[PDB]
Write a protein that binds this ligand. Structure first.
Ligand SMILES: O=c1[nH]c2cc3no[n+]([O-])c3cc2[nH]c1=O
Length: 257
């Protein structure tokens, strides 16, 4: 039985309402729950879903150099594969292998409906509406390291805006957009931004083109006997139209807006 690490992040993995009456994999539902079943079928393995102990994706402490999250669970042997919306990045790929992406995404803008902002350039050319990102992570780093004039102007503003425009969690970023009466715009992954829009009170919108391009991938340890098959399975499901189908199902068929 393959041990699958994953993360409770909607709509990827969520507890079914009647989870206490159930056990094992049946306790969960979501895009990644459906994906794990397809990947297992196509690779021929039995598996057990487990939620990542510390509830994190995967980052390496700059001082201690220890890996936390799902990446940590793979490099320290606690799980055999990670099936979740784990972004394919250079630092992670140095230590684990990623399948080809199963979903595309990029940095985007979340506004409270009615905010007169349509792009990153709009935001950079004004100060009435504050804007920020998660206070740690790649989105913040994107701006910090960018050489593009608009993005550098945005970084300059954000780094010294008061009150602080950075938030501790994704949920706080969403709540701040919702409760700031149009005076705060949040930068985050387009997939989450698209998902919010679609969730009641239906008061947020995704605007502008993505500012970068990335992808989520299934992760396995270096030398894993699972890597090759998992990678072919993702390509097959994309070509059969199944990945698009799952995305449409969890974002729109189950949408409320
Ligand atoms: O560092 C990460 N950060 C992530 C933040 C996310 N917010 O909404 N979804 O879905 C997310 C997926 C993420 N995946 C990552 O690997």
């Amino acid at each position: 039985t393959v041990v699958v690490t994953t993360i409770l992040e909607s709509p990827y993995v969520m507890m079914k309402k009647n989870h206490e009456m159930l056990e094992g994999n049946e306790r969960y539902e979501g895009y990644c729950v459906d994906l794990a079943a397809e990947i297992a079928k196509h690779c021929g393995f039995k598996y057990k879903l487990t939620i990542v102990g510390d509830g994190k994706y995967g980052a390496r402490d700059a001082d201690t150099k220890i890996w936390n999250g799902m990446v940590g669970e793979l490099v320290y042997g606690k799980a055999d594969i990670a099936i979740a919306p784990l972004t394919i990045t250079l630092v992670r790929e140095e230590v684990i292998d990623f399948s080809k992406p199963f979903m595309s995404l990029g940095i985007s803008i979340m506004i409270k409906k009615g905010t007169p902002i349509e792009s990153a350039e709009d935001l950079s050319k004004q100060t009435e509406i504050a804007y920020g990102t998660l206070d740690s992570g790649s989105t913040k780093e994107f701006f910090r390291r960018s050489k593009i004039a608009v993005f550098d102007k945005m970084w300059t503003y954000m780094r010294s805006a008061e009150p602080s425009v950075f938030v501790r969690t994704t949920a706080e970023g969403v709540a701040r957009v919702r409760k700031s009466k149009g005076k705060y715009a949040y930068l985050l992954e387009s997939t989450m931004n698209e998902y919010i829009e679609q969730r009641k009170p239906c008061d947020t919108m995704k605007v502008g083109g993505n500012l970068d391009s990335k992808g989520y991938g299934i992760a396995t340890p270096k030398g894993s006997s699972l890597g090759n098959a998992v990678n072919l399975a993702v390509l097959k499901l994309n070509e059969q139209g199944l990945l698009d189908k799952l995305k449409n199902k969890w974002w729109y068929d189950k949408g409320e807006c």
